[PDB]
Write a protein that binds this ligand. Structure first.
Ligand SMILES: CNC(=O)c1nnc(NC(=O)C2CC2)cc1Nc1cccc(-c2ccc(C(=O)N(C)C)nn2)c1OC
Ligand SMILES: CNC(=O)c1nnc(NC(=O)C2CC2)cc1Nc1cccc(-c2ccc(C(=O)N(C)C)nn2)c1OC
Lengths: 251, 256
């Protein structure tokens, strides 16, 4: 399971942003700089999907996976106490640095992300929310940590799942295979300097794109074109394993 | 000398704060993020002291010294175009984080500052305005396995061009011999160490100009820092006799 944190051990500081049904803050854990993921007032099935994320992340240990200190229950709020990463989300940094991010830097990120996902695949564990926003920069060569997936994908509404297109695996709209799709969509996002395909488009348009099984663009980066195309296949069984992806990233 | 920047190359944005006879803004250099230090409408001796700072900064290169892109003349305003440092002034950060700044973090800052000042000392160059406000944070060093990373800002309008009233406002950072040499920077460094140790709460800073001046006139000494690893260092730096102050070579060696 996960460690229980008393509210006396933590101090809530600046607001960093928002997640699905959460508010993200900087904080202190009694001293360590932490990140506090404050769950909105929620029903037991939502809080349970949040505890399951805490449980999963507490039972894993990988260099490219962010640490989870535990969970604090503060009135109607569930707080996941997590590792603070220096430079924050990758997507934000790619947009600020657009047109000035070298291809070699992007390959380092891809390799490190595939390493974290290969580790989870071998343990038959699913992340379910691979995207640039969940990729944290510990070092700007770069060093990443994949964040916890927040509230589990299984507990969200159709509307929330449509909002996650193109990162959301198509089989999830109506298995470790979903993370191959998430990984492929993240590679496109990285290649396009944080500008993911379909992100501006309406929910109806995003859903229609998946319903007709239209395919996402080929990345402008040629070394990742075959990889993304193989990952972004509608047939989950047709997606390469992370062992294969990781092996193909060394060459 | 320094690079001349045309006004067509720059964009002025948010106000960051004020310096001695300046207004500090975020801006853009054609599009690079920069800091623009806008000199007030001034006398030629003040513009000259500002050009000398730009000249000095343009001829130096060190990892813990902030970069100066050049100067723009627009038109009764002189604009120094400088490097933008992510987290800004150290003194502001120390006050926000008061009581939560570890000693090991403070020692890193001290070594990086002494490294920048040792480089200037070897080149016989004087900064003249070492204080927490001129120490900029490029990296915070809050995460485990990470260290702070500082950039010492340009000294702005030169100390020699300011009024006695402006020099009294600079106590306790201002070297006492400057009230009526590279030695002044050893005093500035010592006063900055006290400020860092006291989480951005420098001694005498609340006190009146009369009190501050009297403190120097009577040659009263500044307090010993609450941090024991820097007590001997600060006491040696904060000596009224400029020749009695240790060299940055000695200070830097003693900090390792
Ligand atoms: C384990 N630690 C962390 O996650 C973390 N660590 N360090 C930092 N540091 C800084 O920001 C440094 C710069 C000060 C930040 C971090 N988290 C973080 C910050 C802001 C928003 C989200 C967010 C956003 C969206 C979602 C979500 O629902 N989707 C579907 C993506 N979820 N969360 C977030 O999580 C990814
Ligand atoms: C080389 N680059 C810079 O100086 C600089 N870079 N990045 C940032 N970033 C942020 O603020 C990030 C956080 C948004 C800020 C910067 N500096 C800056 C900002 C505001 C006021 C002063 C100031 C104040 C006082 C004096 C002065 O008179 N004395 C006597 C010391 N002088 N200047 C200042 O200069 C030290």
């Amino acid at each position: 399971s996960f460690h229980r944190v008393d509210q006396k051990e933590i101090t809530q500081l600046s607001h960093l942003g928002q997640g699905t049904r959460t508010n993200v803050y900087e904080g202190r854990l009694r001293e360590l700089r932490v990140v506090l993921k404050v769950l909105d007032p929620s029903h037991h099935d939502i809080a349970l999907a949040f505890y399951e994320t805490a449980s999963l992340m507490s039972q894993v240990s990988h260099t490219h996976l962010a640490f989870v200190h535990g969970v604090c229950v503060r009135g109607p709020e569930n707080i996941m106490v997590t590792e603070y990463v220096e430079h924050g989300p990758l997507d934000v940094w790619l947009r600020r640095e657009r047109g000035h991010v070298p291809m070699a830097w992007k390959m380092v990120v891809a390799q490190q992300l595939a390493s974290a996902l290969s580790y989870l695949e071998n343990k038959n564990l699913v992340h379910g929310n691979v995207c640039g926003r969940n990729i944290l920069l510990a070092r700007l060569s770069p060093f990443i940590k994949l964040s916890d997936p927040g509230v589990g994908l299984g507990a969200l509404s159709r509307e929330e799942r449509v909002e996650r297109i193109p990162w959301l695996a198509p089989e999830c709209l109506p298995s470790t295979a979903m993370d191959k799709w998430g990984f492929g969509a993240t590679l496109l996002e990285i290649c396009f300097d944080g500008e993911a395909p379909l992100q501006s488009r309406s929910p109806s348009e995003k859903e229609h794109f998946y319903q007709r099984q239209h395919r996402l663009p080929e990345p402008s980066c040629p070394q990742l074109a075959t990889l993304t195309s193989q990952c972004l296949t509608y047939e989950p069984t047709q997606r390469p394993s992370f062992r294969t992806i990781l092996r193909d990233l060394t060459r």
